[PDB]
Design an enzyme around this catalytic site. Sequence first.
Site, PDB file in Angstrom:
ATOM      1  N   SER A  19       6.735   7.410   1.899  1.00  0.00           N
ATOM      2  CA  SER A  19       6.685   7.516   0.442  1.00  0.00           C
ATOM      3  C   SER A  19       5.291   7.153  -0.084  1.00  0.00           C
ATOM      4  O   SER A  19       4.873   7.634  -1.152  1.00  0.00           O
ATOM      5  CB  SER A  19       7.769   6.644  -0.208  1.00  0.00           C
ATOM      6  OG  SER A  19       8.941   6.573   0.605  1.00  0.00           O
ATOM      7  N   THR A  22       0.555  10.092   3.734  1.00  0.00           N
ATOM      8  CA  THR A  22       0.672  10.935   4.872  1.00  0.00           C
ATOM      9  C   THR A  22      -0.548  10.673   5.712  1.00  0.00           C
ATOM     10  O   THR A  22      -1.630  10.493   5.195  1.00  0.00           O
ATOM     11  CB  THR A  22       0.777  12.347   4.401  1.00  0.00           C
ATOM     12  OG1 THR A  22       1.970  12.418   3.627  1.00  0.00           O
ATOM     13  CG2 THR A  22       0.877  13.333   5.548  1.00  0.00           C
ATOM     14  N   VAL A  23      -0.343  10.605   7.014  1.00  0.00           N
ATOM     15  CA  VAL A  23      -1.425  10.335   7.936  1.00  0.00           C
ATOM     16  C   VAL A  23      -1.680  11.530   8.858  1.00  0.00           C
ATOM     17  O   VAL A  23      -0.743  12.126   9.423  1.00  0.00           O
ATOM     18  CB  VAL A  23      -1.172   9.033   8.714  1.00  0.00           C
ATOM     19  CG1 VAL A  23      -2.292   8.751   9.710  1.00  0.00           C
ATOM     20  CG2 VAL A  23      -1.048   7.882   7.725  1.00  0.00           C
ATOM     21  N   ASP A 126       2.298  -8.345   6.612  1.00  0.00           N
ATOM     22  CA  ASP A 126       3.198  -7.507   7.379  1.00  0.00           C
ATOM     23  C   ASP A 126       2.802  -7.370   8.837  1.00  0.00           C
ATOM     24  O   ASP A 126       2.799  -6.313   9.372  1.00  0.00           O
ATOM     25  CB  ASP A 126       3.344  -6.137   6.740  1.00  0.00           C
ATOM     26  CG  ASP A 126       4.654  -5.460   7.047  1.00  0.00           C
ATOM     27  OD1 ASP A 126       5.562  -6.024   7.635  1.00  0.00           O
ATOM     28  OD2 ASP A 126       4.778  -4.318   6.663  1.00  0.00           O
TER      29      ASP A 126
END
Length: 254
Positions: A19, A22-23, A126
Site C-alpha cells: 500500500s 512498489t519496488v 521495525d
Amino acid sequence: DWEIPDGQITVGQRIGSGSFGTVYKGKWHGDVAVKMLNAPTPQQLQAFKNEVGVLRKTRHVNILLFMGYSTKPQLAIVTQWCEGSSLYHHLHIIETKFEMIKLIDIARQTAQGMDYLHAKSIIHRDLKSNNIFLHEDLTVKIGDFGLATSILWMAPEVIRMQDKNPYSFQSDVYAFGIVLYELMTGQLPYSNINNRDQIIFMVGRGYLSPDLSKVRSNCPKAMKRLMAECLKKKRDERPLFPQILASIELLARS
Ligand SMILES: CNc1ncc2cc(-c3cc(NC(=O)NCCC(C)(C)C)c(F)cc3C)c(C)nc2n1
C-alpha cells in the site's frame, strides 16, 4: 545533491508492491533498487522527505546504501541492489542451517549497524529478521524491506501503547533480542500459539515471553545471557548497543 537527474534510471523487473509503494530492480550505474511511492498527497510527500532525510544521514556497511532520489514523475528512493535473501527467509522459509560462528557473525554485524543508527539518533522502529538482509550471503544490511507502513519483535511497552511515544533505543534492543532468539533457535517466538490477539495481549502484560530453553546447547552461555538481557520486560533494564556490541565482540574473540 542526491537528486537523480531525470530519465537516467532504467526501471526493470517489479519486485514487490504494497500500500505504501512498489519496488523495482533498476539500472543506474549498475543494479539499483527503486522504491516508488505513487499524484502525491501531502501525507505522502512528508513521508518521502522523512525517509530520504534519514537515509542520507547513513554511511555504514551494515546499513543499506542510499544512492539517491527522484522527484518526478513519481517520488522514488534509490538504494543499492541487494543479492540473496533476508535472514527471515534463510531461517524460516528455506531453513538454512548456519554454523554457530556464522550465527554469531550475523549477530555482530546487525549490532554494528544498530549501534551506528543509534549513534546518529535513528530509531529503527521495525527491526525484524525480515529487515536484515544477507547480501551475497555474507553481509548484513539493515533496512526496511517492507511495503506495508509485525508483532513478534514488538517490546511489551510498544504493544501497550500507553506511554506514547513508546519507541526508543530500547524497543529496538528488544526487537534485536527477538532476532538473537531466531538466530539461536532457528524459530519464531510463540510458535505454539496460533492466535495473534492473545500473543499481543499476553506479551504486553508480561504473561508470555520467548522460551529461552529452546536455545541450541552449542550457543555460548554469554550469548544466551545477552539475549535474556535484551529481552527484558522493563525497558530500562535492557543494555544499549555499545554494550551489546562489546559483548558480541568480546565473546567472538573466544
Ligand atoms: C530484494 N533486494 C532488495 N535490495 C534493496 C532494497 C532496497 C529497498 C529500499 C528500502 C528503503 N528504505 C529503507 O531501507 N528504510 C529504512 C532505513 C533505515 C535503516 C536507515 C532506518 C528505501 F527508501 C528504498 C528502497 C529501494 C527495498 C524496499 N527493498 C530492497 N530489496
